[PDB]
């Protein structure tokens, strides 16, 4: 049988319901062979290369591409060369909202300095005892959970006055 | 001068007082806290001085000399004043190139306050407040000299040419025993 | 670790934690604190008295600078001819003590060795 | 951004967790326009055409394609000109089990007679009050729930003594 | 790592800060206490590492 459009909506709803256990992760602190366009990520893997750390997700929501005029006044988002709108879990099958939005920010001295070349999002992460802070290095994590999405990325700096930031819009199927 | 008004550290080696015995349900004097670490640092200085001396090279501190007599010292470990310090100042001095010249390291004390370094404020709150300010810090940066007699000599030269050496970690009292 | 100061408001109140640093044995870890090494079922080298690494490195200059390398005792060579391989002749270096290029060497047991037989024509 | 295999697996786990609410459904009791050449399943469809009824799923599990030597002593499955093995939910990621197996039998006279041409599996079905039986016509159902998976077929026929067994193997992403 | 939220140890060898100078009528910080013991043990460690190695019997 076929996997239907609304099956992808219900699976996007499930991933959004896990939001409290969702963390950004970043990695690959040493170069690729060439830096303009790195290769495809090997989806059999469950952890980043050269893991730098983890930061709790600030935002997790359903989204969909917008249509003009009436969506242009709503809870608007921009990503992936398209205009988007936020969708709440109880509207998901009326809006058609099969896409999951994920985002976090890193500020000041809270994680290692320099540059990075891999990005991903995990669910079900757990810290070691007594560590309640939202920024974690690999020795402070008790369990890394499941790496849901990850990719190879062009680098940026972080230094003493600059905000670093990472986000995705993601779904269960690339093309039917 | 830590006996002064802000701190009032009561430490003095002549009194032969080695421990601060706190008691319950009494004020916690800041002077007691200062003396608590001063005693330990003084005895650690004594323990170092019975083995080492002011300028004793442990490892690293490789010197280099340019054609313009510019002398540059790389990172390493050295005994200077009651402690073994990791030098990494990346300091440089130019030698005259005539007569005896004694490169040495000078230790400069400086008081760092929350007004200068904002990170010394209370981390739990994370912002300027009435309760944010707290203790100060004593900063001891190392600098390179040419012929200052007060500084700890690390190398000696004549006419630009190196005059005395050790292949291994310098220890003044160990050499006096070996001799 | 709970406060036990009798007759105060903070009695039985929680306070500071403690950092506990305990020790245990390990095998062939290059970062471990090597207490001994053993050769073929015996102790390889003696560890007689208090150890100081940089004091021995100060002596590593003076030893060869004063009298070079020299044997103290032992280290005789004996042929034994053991059948460890038909193309080798086996030999033993006896127990002994020496000073070599800065450092003392002291073995409580003989060390077993072998050399290939000669078949070149 | 692109999908991962780890996500296909966790989403198959979620649809296996729903098993108690899962029913087979069959429909399309009159001819196609061409009985040799049915159309494709239009994925936004919420119910079968000409619904005959519902039967509780007799089996719901994760599966993966069978491989020698390690499956030479495990629970075998034969389906769709292929061979398969069962996977338990707490082994899904280690086994790579992104496929769901769904099956039921409609036996003898327990649901309406004649021909059928549509087949699928729902979740979240509820019967009307006082009905506890596992075979239901649409007038005994109170809520039909959500149709996860369905497909079209060329026709088959039942007389009162004869049985229809219907099943699918599915995954969240159809082709790459 | 003692630099994190439960303890917030502010000690760092590269800053060359060797003494915590407390002041009167101020709110006491546990981070200052942690740094106070961290320093004097760090210089005892440097003193030890100039004589010994992480594999010596006494």
Three-state secondary structure string covering C89-121: EEEEECCEEEEECCEEEEECCCEEEEEECCCCC
Give the torsion through C-alpha atoms of A54, A57, A62, A64, to 10 deg.
-80
Yes or no, beta carbons of D4 and A176 under 8 Å apart: no
Which of B152, B111, B99 has the alpha carbon at shortest distance from B135? Answer: B111
Structure tokens of A70?
């009436």
Give chain A's end-to-end CA distance (angstroms, integer): 13
Question: Which chain E residues contact residue B28 at CB under 8 A?
Answer: 28
- What lies within 8 Å, CB to CB, of B170 at 6+ separation is B52, B53, B55, B56, B57, B58, B79
The whole-angstrom separation of Cα B49 and Cα B37 is 18
Question: Which chain E residues contact residue B123 at CB under 8 A?
Answer: 8, 10, 29, 31
The whole-angstrom separation of Cα D97 and Cα C36 is 50
Question: Which chain B residues contact residue C54 at CB under 8 A?
Answer: 58, 168-169, 171
- What lies within 8 Å, CB to CB, of D10 at 6+ separation is A146, A148, D92, D93
C and B touch with 3+ CB pairs <8 Å, answer: yes
The whole-angstrom separation of Cα E41 and Cα E13 is 12
From residue D127, give the alpha-carbon distance in Å to each of B162, C100, D11, D146.
99, 92, 26, 14
Yes or no, beta carbons of A139 and E1 under 8 Å apart: yes
Yes or no, beta carbons of E4 and A131 under 8 Å apart: yes
Closest CA–CA distance from residue C107 to any residue of chain E (Å): 18
Q: Is E21 on the interface with B (CB under 8 A)?
A: yes
Report yes or no: B175 and E57 within 8 Å, Cβ to Cβ.
Answer: no
Burial of B108 (0-12, 13-18, 19+ CB in 10 A): exposed
Question: Which chain E residues contact residue A139 at CB under 8 A?
Answer: 1
Place of tokens 């390889």: C44
Kindly identify which residue of chain B lies nearest to residue E50, measuring between CA atoms.
Answer: B58
Yes or no, beta carbons of D146 and A6 under 8 Å apart: yes
Question: Which chain C residues contact residue E50 at CB under 8 A?
Answer: 54
Burial of D30 (0-12, 13-18, 19+ CB in 10 A): exposed
Closest CA–CA distance from residue C118 to any residue of chain E (Å): 43
Residue D13 DSSP one-character state: H
Resolution of the PDB structure in angstroms: 4.4
Say how many residues make up chain A: 176
φ and ψ of A71, to 5 deg: -75, -15
Closest CA–CA distance from residue A116 to any residue of chain E (Å): 22
CA atoms within 13 A on the CB side of B98: 1
Q: Considering only residues 16 to 45 of chain E, which have any Cβ-Cβ distance to chain C shorter than 8 Å?
A: none
The whole-angstrom separation of Cα B18 and Cα B10 is 12
Q: Residue C8, SS3? A: coil
Report yes or no: B135 and B36 within 8 Å, Cβ to Cβ.
Answer: no
- What lies within 8 Å, CB to CB, of B76 at 6+ separation is B57, B58, B59, B60, B61, B62, B86, B87
Say how many residues make up chain C: 121
φ and ψ of A78, to 5 deg: -130, 130
Closest CA–CA distance from residue E43 to any residue of chain B (Å): 6
The whole-angstrom separation of Cα E11 and Cα E33 is 10
The whole-angstrom separation of Cα D68 and Cα D73 is 9
Q: Which of A24, A98, A173 to mutate to test the interface with D (most CBs of D within 10 A)?
A: A173
DSSP E strands in chain A: the ranges are 23-27, 53-56, 59-65, 76-79, 82-87, 99-106, 114-115, 118-123, 126-127, 135-136, 141-143, 146-152, 157-158, 164-170
- What lies within 8 Å, CB to CB, of B164 at 6+ separation is B156
Kindly identify which residue of chain D lies nearest to residue A153, measuring between CA atoms.
Answer: D1
Burial of D120 (0-12, 13-18, 19+ CB in 10 A): buried
Report yes or no: B60 and B41 within 8 Å, Cβ to Cβ.
Answer: no
φ and ψ of B110, to 5 deg: -155, 145
Structure tokens of D35?
């009985």
- What lies within 8 Å, CB to CB, of A75 at 6+ separation is A85, A86
Kindly identify which residue of chain D lies nearest to residue A15, measuring between CA atoms.
Answer: D11
The whole-angstrom separation of Cα B144 and Cα B102 is 11
Kindly identify which residue of chain E lies nearest to residue B141, measuring between CA atoms.
Answer: E16
- What lies within 8 Å, CB to CB, of B4 at 6+ separation is none
Structure tokens of D134?
């596992």
Question: For the stretch D56-88, what's the b/e string if a residue is b when 16 or more beta carbons lie within 10 angstroms of its beta carbon?
Answer: bbeebbbbbebeeeebeeeeebeeeeeebbbbe
E and C touch with 3+ CB pairs <8 Å, answer: yes
């Amino acid at each position: 049988a076929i996997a239907t459009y609304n099956s992808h909506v219900e699976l996007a709803k499930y991933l959004v319901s896990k939001a409290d256990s969702v963390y950004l992760t970043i990695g690959k602190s040493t170069p690729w062979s060439n830096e303009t366009n790195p290769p495809q990520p090997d989806e059999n893997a469950t952890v980043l290369q050269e893991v730098i750390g983890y930061k709790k997700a600030t935002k997790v929501t359903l989204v969909r591409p917008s249509k003009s005029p009436e969506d242009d006044n709503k809870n608007l988002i921009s990503y992936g060369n398209k205009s988007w709108v936020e969708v709440t879990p109880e509207n998901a099958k009326a809006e058609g909202a099969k896409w999951v939005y994920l985002e976090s920010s890193i500020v000041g001295d809270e994680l290692p300095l320099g540059t990075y070349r891999q990005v991903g999002f995990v669910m079900d992460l757990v810290a070691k005892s007594g560590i309640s802070k939202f920024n974690l290095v690999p020795s402070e994590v008790e369990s890394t959970g499941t790496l849901l999405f990850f990719d190879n990325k062009q680098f940026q700096n972080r230094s003493e006055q600059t905000t670093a930031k990472e986000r995705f819009i993601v779904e269960v199927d690339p093309n039917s | 001068n830590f006996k002064g008004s802000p701190y009032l550290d009561r430490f003095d080696p002549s009194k032969d007082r080695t421990k601060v015995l706190f008691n319950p349900d009494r004020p916690l004097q800041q002077a007691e806290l200062n003396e608590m670490q001063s005693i330990d640092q003084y005895y650690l200085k004594n323990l170092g001085d019975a083995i080492f001396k002011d300028g004793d090279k442990q490892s690293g501190l490789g010197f280099t000399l340019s054609e313009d007599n510019v002398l540059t010292v790389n990172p390493g470990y050295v005994y200077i004043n009651g402690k073994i310090r990791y030098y990494d100042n990346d300091d440089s001095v130019k030698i005259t190139g005539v007569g005896k010249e004694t490169i040495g390291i000078k230790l400069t004390e400086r008081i760092v306050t929350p007004d200068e370094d904002a990170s010394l404020l209370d981390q739990t709150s994370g912002v300027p407040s009435y309760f944010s300010k707290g203790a100060d810090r004593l900063e001891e940066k190392m600098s390179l000299t040419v012929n200052d007699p007060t500084s700890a000599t690390i190398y000696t030269f004549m006419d630009g040419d190196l005059y005395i050496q050790s292949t291994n970690a310098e220890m003044d009292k160990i050499n006096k025993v070996l001799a | 670790l709970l406060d036990q100061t009798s007759g105060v408001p903070s009695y039985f109140s929680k306070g500071a934690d403690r950092l506990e640093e305990k020790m245990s044995l390990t095998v062939n870890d290059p970062t471990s604190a090597t207490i001994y090494t053993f050769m073929d079922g015996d102790l390889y080298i003696q560890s007689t008295n208090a150890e100081m690494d940089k004091i021995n490195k100060v002596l590593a200059e003076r030893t060869y600078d004063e009298s070079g390398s020299y044997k103290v005792n032992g280290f005789e060579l004996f042929s034994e001819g053991n059948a460890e391989d038909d193309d080798h002749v086996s030999v033993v270096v006896d127990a002994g003590k020496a000073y070599v290029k800065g450092f003392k060497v002291d073995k409580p047991v003989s060390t077993r060795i072998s050399v290939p037989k000669s078949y070149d024509l």
